[PDB]
């Protein structure tokens, strides 16, 4: 394939230059993941009204222990159920192009923009894992994160990643999946959003949930249908404990 | 990689064909555009409930100056402010892979789409031209590029272009970057939607802003930053004075 | 031309003597100006009731850049677009008295009244820069006039000025034109004075707006017309947008 | 005496010349006028609310006799009668500086801003001419000097000027005498302003006249009563026909 034509940029504006080691390496993957994988993104919204008066009673016994419940140990665990039921999510495609490696542990990463770049730490089998012992984890992994103090070995062997973004904003996004990954799970910002009770429109504060999918592997019906699962998972976190 | 395999069309159905020469300028250029950059994008609402009472009320000074104020001059600059608060979306990748050439002129394009095809006209130095004056060269721009007036000079040097196609229709759009360019802000359809006022539901016109991003330089985080402060100076243009 | 005669002033009271370099060289530049220039002053009132209610709101947002927004960031502005609407406001005397010297960029000074004097700190390219650019500037400047830290290249290439006095005190004044430039903008105290709605009246805050002009270039009606607009810039800031 | 210092304007901006030779005849003449005289401007407002009254009820017979009844033919007369009592506003200096020329007869002329200049065209007794007969040569006088068609000789003799510019803008002004003259008449913007009744407030529509003189002949004294008494003849014109 052909690239972008050398442009003299000199000639118009002023100008100034240079990279950075990491952001280069975070580049490079970015062109090989899009360049070997199939894309398309399916937006789902899950009703996080009850989550969310979940997080905020828990405060207490957060501060005890000394963590911060967000809404991402959360999330890590709505996924690792759900990955569970649907092994299709936690695969690769073999280098033969032909078998599906189905992974029986689940390791998810997430996406910790730091000022060097990228960098997407690891927690192992967070399905043996509860919301205190992931969220200390996530705090760990993401403060190692912006202090270059993570070692490569916690950058390895991730079976799905979530690419959580709601504290910054927007509503909806296109990930792309960290491959040999085939799957990553995007997330926006919350809001109040109107839904109707059969009878009334009320306010319910909804998540943004925008994930890449490997069509290789994941169709476009068993994509979704992990995603109307993450929704319901979500409403009630108690379909986990189940 | 391969290409699509030759299919006998004449099969089936009845068949005609040809095209143009612009239109293969186009095809060539939006191939390269999405074989060389990474492709995610950004969906954000801005509230415009105070700016289209002002475009209304600022009619009888239009017509004045002869122009006709519409929501292009007003997006070029909360686009020309916001480029200079954040520098890395007015870039572009070195051919050496491995730095980053910073623009410190804002020269912003706008898609005009013409019968024999996509053209792009730059309007430079819009950070240093009023609403008035934009809109003037907006609209001289575009009444030049449907005569087929447009000197291959005015369409060089763009920093960052828009994709405005809010008067034909739809919600959202994932627009493609135009090269060696690092982002594109889309936008469409403006609709009266429900927003929450802390207590209760309220109509209030949203403009919808689609913007796609190479992430080889703009990551997840910097790139929702940028839009989530577009949504801030759109809801406020006041904000561009300051 | 004859001067003043000299008085033995101790035949009456007693005396002390001694000046300063500064505020002699400031001295003879006044005494230049002032017989070279034929002076002349306009005084215009500005409705600002909706800028002074502006500048209060956006508070919070200036201590979060670390700014203080004052008024003369807004003049500074109301000033630098009616400039490039009036070029005859920007340019000056050739040394052959037969031509005009139209600048294109519009680098305005202010008066910063100091111990050792007056310093007229010029702030480059002003239409290029919003309101927290310039007051950050305006406050370093100023800074370093009363620390006696400013470059003369600082006080070099002004097209403009603005006496700007309204923290002091007074109502009306006749402020003298720095040349080679050709108009100076004086500002007093603002009160909230009496203004009839065609039916009633109102109270509303108005800002004394008293500027020099050298007739040699700029007429009665030319310089009566850029204040009228500055007034009209004033009262509705978002016309600058425009 | 030294003027102004050189300046290299092409070190920071970019430059255009030029001027013509009319402004270049203004120039000098302003130049003469205020190295030779000692200026000093007069500000009092005259209560005109009986004279708009009966300058709108009268254009049905100004249409009929085809003139514009504006303020400046009341204005001249005003002034006509005015300057009959008070002959030391109709002189001028003589050359031996030691005594005073008193014009017998009073030839008023006004200030005409045209694009290549200013131009004074002046009234021949203006005393021994009706509003309407004034305001018609006014209105050929003033249409000859925007088409050049003003002959030499119908700018010279004239005792006093008017440099009328409320149609324009402004509150104040500080006009020059146009020597060998002793005086001019500046008049800006009509504003209704509250005027106490002895018991209440109460609007009522102001003219601005700021009227300049030389005090080689006029003093401080004589020059307000100048003003004041033309206060009482702009409020009751009826003390104009007496």
Sequence with gaps: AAAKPATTE????????????????????????????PHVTLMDEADVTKLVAHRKKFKAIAAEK???????????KALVSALREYPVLNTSIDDETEEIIQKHYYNIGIAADTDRGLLVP??????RKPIFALAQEINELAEKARDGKLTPGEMKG???????????????????????????????????????????????????????????????????????????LLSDPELLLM
């Design 10 to 37: 000199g000639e118009f504006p002023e100008t100034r230059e240079k990279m950075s080691g990491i952001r280069r390496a975070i580049a490079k993957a970015m062109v090989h993941s899009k360049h070997t994988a």
């Design 66 to 76: 000394g963590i911060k419940l967000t809404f991402l140990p959360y999330v890590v």
């Design 122 to 127: 690891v927690i192992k089998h967070a399905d």
């Design 158 to 232: 991730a079976s799905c990643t979530i690419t959580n973004i709601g504290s910054a904003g927007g509503q909806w996004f296109t990930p792309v999946i960290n491959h040999p990954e085939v799957a990553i799970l995007g997330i926006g910002r919350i809001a109040e959003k109107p839904i109707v009770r059969d009878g009334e429109i009320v306010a319910a504060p909804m998540l943004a949930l925008s994930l890449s999918f490997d069509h290789r592997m994941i169709d476009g019906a068993t994509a979704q249908k992990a995603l109307n699962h993450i929704k319901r």
